[PDB]
Design a protein around this ligand. Sequence first.
Ligand SMILES: [Fe+3]
Ligand SMILES: [Fe+3]
Ligand SMILES: [Fe+3]
Ligand SMILES: [Fe+3]
Lengths: 491, 491, 82, 82, 102, 102, 305, 305
Amino acid sequence: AMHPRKDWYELTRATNWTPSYVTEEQLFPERMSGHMGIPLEKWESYDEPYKTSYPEYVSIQREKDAGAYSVKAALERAKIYENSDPGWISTLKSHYGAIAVGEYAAVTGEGRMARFSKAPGNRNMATFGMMDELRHGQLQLFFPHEYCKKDRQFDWAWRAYHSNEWAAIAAKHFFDDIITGRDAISVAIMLTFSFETGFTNMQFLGLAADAAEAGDYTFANLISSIQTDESRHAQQGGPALQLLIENGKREEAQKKVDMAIWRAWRLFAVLTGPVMDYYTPLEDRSQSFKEFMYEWIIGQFERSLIDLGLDKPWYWDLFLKDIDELHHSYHMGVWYWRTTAWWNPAAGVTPEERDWLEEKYPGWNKRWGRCWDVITENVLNDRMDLVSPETLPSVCNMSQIPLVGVPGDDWNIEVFSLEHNGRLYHFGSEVDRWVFQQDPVQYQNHMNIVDRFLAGQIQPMTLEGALKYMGFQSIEEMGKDAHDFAWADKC
Amino acid sequence: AMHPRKDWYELTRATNWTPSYVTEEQLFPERMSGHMGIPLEKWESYDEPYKTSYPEYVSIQREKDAGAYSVKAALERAKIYENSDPGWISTLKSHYGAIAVGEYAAVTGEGRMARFSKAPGNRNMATFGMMDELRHGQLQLFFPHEYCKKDRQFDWAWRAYHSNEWAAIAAKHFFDDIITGRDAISVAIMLTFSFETGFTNMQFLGLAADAAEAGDYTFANLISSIQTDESRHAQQGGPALQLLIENGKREEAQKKVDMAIWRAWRLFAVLTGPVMDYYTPLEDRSQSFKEFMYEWIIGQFERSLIDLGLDKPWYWDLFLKDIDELHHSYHMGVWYWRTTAWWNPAAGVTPEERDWLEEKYPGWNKRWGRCWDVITENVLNDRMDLVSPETLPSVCNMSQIPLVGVPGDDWNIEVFSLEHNGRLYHFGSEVDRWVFQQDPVQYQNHMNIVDRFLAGQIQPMTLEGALKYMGFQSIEEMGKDAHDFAWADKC
Amino acid sequence: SAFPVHAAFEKDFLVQLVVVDLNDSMDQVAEKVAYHCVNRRVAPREGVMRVRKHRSTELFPRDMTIAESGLNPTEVIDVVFE
Amino acid sequence: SAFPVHAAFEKDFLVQLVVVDLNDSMDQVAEKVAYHCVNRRVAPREGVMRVRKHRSTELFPRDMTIAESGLNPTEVIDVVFE
Amino acid sequence: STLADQALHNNNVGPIIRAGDLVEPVIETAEIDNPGKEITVEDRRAYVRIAAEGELILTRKTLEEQLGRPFNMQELEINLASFAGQIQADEDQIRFYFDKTM
Amino acid sequence: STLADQALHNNNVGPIIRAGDLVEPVIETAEIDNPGKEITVEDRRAYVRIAAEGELILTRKTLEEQLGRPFNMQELEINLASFAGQIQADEDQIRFYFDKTM
Amino acid sequence: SFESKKPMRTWSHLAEMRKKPSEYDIVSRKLHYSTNNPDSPWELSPDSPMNLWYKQYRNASPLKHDNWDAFTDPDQLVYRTYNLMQDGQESYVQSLFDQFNEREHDQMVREGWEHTMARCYSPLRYLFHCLQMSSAYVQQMAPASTISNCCILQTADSLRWLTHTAYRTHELSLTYPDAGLGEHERELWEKEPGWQGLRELMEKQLTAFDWGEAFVSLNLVVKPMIVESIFKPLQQQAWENNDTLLPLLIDSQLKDAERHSRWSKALVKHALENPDNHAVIEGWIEKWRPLADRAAEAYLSMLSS
Amino acid sequence: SFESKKPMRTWSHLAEMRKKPSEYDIVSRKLHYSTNNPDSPWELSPDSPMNLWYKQYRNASPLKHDNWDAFTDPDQLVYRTYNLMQDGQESYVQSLFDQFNEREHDQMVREGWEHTMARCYSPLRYLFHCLQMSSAYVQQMAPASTISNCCILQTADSLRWLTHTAYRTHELSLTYPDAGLGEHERELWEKEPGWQGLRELMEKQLTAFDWGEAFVSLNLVVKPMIVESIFKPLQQQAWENNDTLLPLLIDSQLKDAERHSRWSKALVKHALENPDNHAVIEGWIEKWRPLADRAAEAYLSMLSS
Ligand SMILES: [Fe+3]
Ligand SMILES: [Fe+3]
Ligand SMILES: [Fe+3]
Ligand SMILES: [Fe+3]
């Protein structure tokens, strides 16, 4: 006979002891552990709600991978790369570039907990978390690797985090801030709770729905399998938050959640927004980006946050307005500066798409539509110089993304600036400035790409000098319109 | 350490002994064993060329099924049933109906060997063969089962071998003759050598190629996985044939191969031929039926038969002519009598298809084209009564398939008849008559469906009385044109 | 005196069961076969239809009945044009 | 005396880095920003373009130079129509 | 924030099942194991969102019966792509639930 | 029977690999392990027909190196959908071959 | 005439089940079409040789039931789940072999044990292959596919045990190359008196062609005798001769054997719904028991001396 | 300017390899982007707290190599193949637990053995969790992803052993409910003298934050001492107290331990391409050895009395 897990599980996490040959603080230094002075004994009440044990883990994960790899192998000749809409291929390229090595970085957030959390159940669940992110890093290198021989832009699945390309900087600035650059309890709260019960469902399930509509089952099956792991190891954060609240640290907990959700939001708006509302072919759009937001972040995530005893973040109304607006502007920036991206943005503004955009975002044509009217007219009249830029966008000192506003008939744009320690910083929202002010030692001497351009570090100081600095190694790697402007014909 | 299989494999088949408490003949009766008087000791030189052992078997087959089921599960929402061409859906329905329970029957040919072969290596490889066919029977019931809720014709995946529908009779007459109705050595030679290195590659790999073109990877991945087992257990037949030849039985061996290949041919021409040249959408036809024949049966199978020391069968030139002709006529019979089929035949004669047919079979339009000219004219003129039959085809007393010839400008048709024991039989070729004459006790009192109709067994003696006799349980189950005649519009 | 024969009609692609009558002329048999053939799979044409035993060279006379013919039930006949 | 500013052009969707000159009139600055905007993402129009500090209510005079303006490098300006 | 208020003030809990062989068995299980609760289902092709108000139980014994093959509760993880509600899971069942009523 | 004669009189042997992760590794292995033989490949999407004249060897060590992961020769069965030639197989290699020369 | 009818959620023959059909039901039930026509099991001449064989040895068996097809494997195994189960068990056994080999287990058995193995253990390969053949026979003759499926897996299990025995015979011979391990087992099976009861038993059982008598003699007489008179005494002898691998291997094989006993008993329970079958089954058990007892007795006196 | 270049058959960093890249190469090599910028490991302020930590405890380590990333796991394990391997091994161990439980193995151990287990075996869960924590630390600090991958799997193996110990502690307590099994292990780890050497050793090792010293002290001093001074003496004691399960379980754990020693030695071999690293490594081994020896000695005198 075997004994049931309930009967012996407690011994697996009976691993706290009272240090004697070093102090408790030496063994769990606050800068790595982030226990906020809460003593070891209080952490023993931590109770991970989604348990696993080592023999079940290896067995089940064996089965998860068996299915992921089988499906990849069975569909290799489906001609996705050749038969898909090129906006779909670009979605793959940005996804793998923006995520694969970021998953592997997440091993280090989970390792931070496995070593430095004072909660014993956290240290074990983090050990499975380490293993999970290892899986996710290896899957999302292995899957795009077969496309290297087709297209050098797929080399950025591996290369992007090794570059200074603007979006890779945005991604690394975010992940280094919430995953690899803070103490264990901050990782529990900012990564596993805020990012991984909030936003990753958008990229890895919302996008899966579009992939399934697009007939790309290899990818949909991959990323929904990945998210099954997340659903387990993300449950490390709730129990940490509950403990912090029970021990007088509600305010600190709340500030960390508020900060992580805003930071995650700006990056997902520039990567997932354009994908969902523009790159994904019209007839594959399961829902709009905003509809998916209201399902996953407002309806599911925010309701969980309230259930755990936290508050709606102070910026909630700003956030809701931002969902209606920001990614349309971010799409435009990525598309106009497409040559600095390692994928091929689709403009997504054929008349049919513009009718859809107007339905999903009433007032769109009198705003962003005004910009796309000019661009589209230049394309029809083969004025292609007016469709490539000759300067840099100004960039946020927090999110690393261009500073944008609402264009057209009711034009509004606002930069939120700050002097600090003899330097002038610029932010794309009230919230991004606030995040900086919450922890200036984390950010103050960081230089965004435009800061670097003006400081002499990018040579020559030219758009070409900047493309070289960003890591592009051949003409084929820089982004182009996904359809070579064929969409203009539909106009 | 583990010891390599080469070092201990011989002990696994060291299982012949000299009987003492019963005689050798009692233990291996000739009617079940078919040893042709060759003594036990000669059979010990049998050496299966594709070995396996029990721990490798269970391990590897676990992995085969893991991949088959994963892929099915990952593609359930691809909408094959709704989005496929209806000729493709009909191909699925005939395949599962004509094969699933026939696979399960094949367990019994393998069991016949496992018990009654005097070759010890044969008895073990047959034990894996039993297991393989069990797999194949269960897969090809499990896969079509989810479509029951869509379409009653998928109920014939299970029902067909339990019916008296004409094609199910043809299939059972063949499989009971070569698989379940003869001694062990006959099964080795007729099933594992003749059928399973010859023709099953057509249905299970040739068709897979069309399925992959048709974008049905669940099915292509399934049936090519099935054929990997066949490739192993089919290797029981070569070594039996070699032994028979070494022991003076070449002539008996040759007659059994000749008979099994012809019998297999007529059934595959009526099921696989129409599928490959008519039901499969034009743009999914990897090769024509004849091209696949020349690849698999002439180029691969016949060359193996020669390599093993046998002769081209005496009917080779008849066979080659038949490849050019028979299935076009069989297609026509299945399509004109579609109401007696459990699938929906596609006529496959739009002008585009007829150009293809003419390229693949020069002279087609002046032959079968002449028939399809009349039919097509009746459809265009909505004379639908001229497109349904009002009598029965005459049917072969060997293959159970209608008697056909070449129609049109150079009309030729021939029935080969035989009186035997006070009864008149009719056969659709010289070879089918010869097969009967080779073993009249196997066939003589068998009654084909038309014999039964004329003998009073089908009541009422009407087409409807016959449809009821054939097992149809509702109006939806009987075959219809796959496209409801929409092809006439293309004309 | 239903009388089954198996009949192959000229230019058609198969042999079919047709039930004729014992007292039927070869003209009437040729009609009954044509019923299941002409304008279904075989184009109509001018000429006289004739009946022979399958693959025969002898035609049966037009007025001869199946009864006077010595055909046995279920034997194969061809229906052909002069 | 290259002088970087960050400039938001009326009806455009972003803020851009534009490098102006220390001795430049507000008229010349407004041209240099328009270069990267008008007929790219923003439709041309009649009217006088004016320059203000970002979100300001005060316009800089047309003849004033960035030098006489007291702007610091990398400060944000708006380019707007009267 | 009417649209947003209304989206936030829900008490929906339950599994999000990725496309595969667990979708229909779980829907059926949700209905059987929560009698007199309405089960809602939103099909997004790559996944299905299954919910009830306030609490949704899936028992291993029912899920095994609906799947039609031997099933251990921990295996649900292979297809549990997300969930709404807090979770408590054991060898016999998984419960999705909220502490508050919004 | 010119077409048929010519199709019959071949000495082609070698594996038919079903679609999947073994197709390119086997092609590459066939080339490396039979130097100075021409390897022909016919791609039918669901499977690939790989051949040489008279004999075609696949060694486990080369196949493991081309696949890029640990590989036991018996595992080839997962993807060996058919083959031309007689086969002799062991822990180290599989040989496809004919006794006669047509 | 023909009515309209809606699609069914499962096969037409399961469509009246109250419960949702399982994987087992869907892929295992009512697949022998050879029982549909009592005059012509197979679609051939009604008096073909194999039609006569089945009409005699299946249809005419004294063991009678009006619904054999309603038999259910208590374990509800399908091919898929058999391979999952046996891959786990056989991977465990192979790991035992590997680890006990590393530890040079065979060098520490009691003096002489290799000779007892060479006499009493390595010739089991013949006995187990007889089980294998015999299981395949019940498979092909049983009148319901759910019965036959149990036999197929039992046939595979027989081969499993056969292969264990082959592997260990060869391995043992490497430490003990002068006991005739791997060389003399056929002579032993044919001529050694301790093997002659078993060999007489199986040769006569293999020629019992009635499906009912085949099943009863194989599964209710022979195989329970192997468990009590061969498997368990061998474990005890291993214990006294410091062979700690053999008891673990035989405990794995006994799991298989218990599973065969389980479906067997369930088939007895199903057949006994018909009252006549009590005398039929009990008659065949009495017929075969003295051979089985003789076999056991000769084996044990060979083992215990 | 920008030239045209063709697609590559693999990542640009492997594209000069002579051999076709393996699964291992493709998914494991050169993934730490945090080593690219020596002034700012992480994309944040250059003097952020974690940037300082890494510049101090990774970049400034006395253990130096110009190409850490060329390190290769001798086992070339990836996540996929680790789970295949450990599912086989752990399925075997769980089957051992099941079978030895069936046989009521624990009731036959020598009188008093439960007391020796409760003192010397069940508190290992603390020790093994220390290995787990410590492995996770080398993971996060090591300067190449191929090194870190070895640590991740080693971290999982530590948890594996921890979980064995938890399972067996609980199971043993069911036959022996009056030895304090599952109740008194923390008091033992904190106060029993046989545990105090080990506990002092790990508490000080867990506060060695230099990645090089962390790796050397964990993998080259502590873990080899556990193998020779804990694992193997425990197997011998089990042998003398009729515990035949513990030696088999510990032989499974020793496979894991041998694998850690293998990648460790391979990392030493790689680092010693640089001549200075000999004195660095040897210095740290001398520093840590007396703690390790003290730990071992106290454990064994507790075990052997
Ligand atoms: Fe992840
Ligand atoms: Fe994660
Ligand atoms: Fe088969
Ligand atoms: Fe087969």
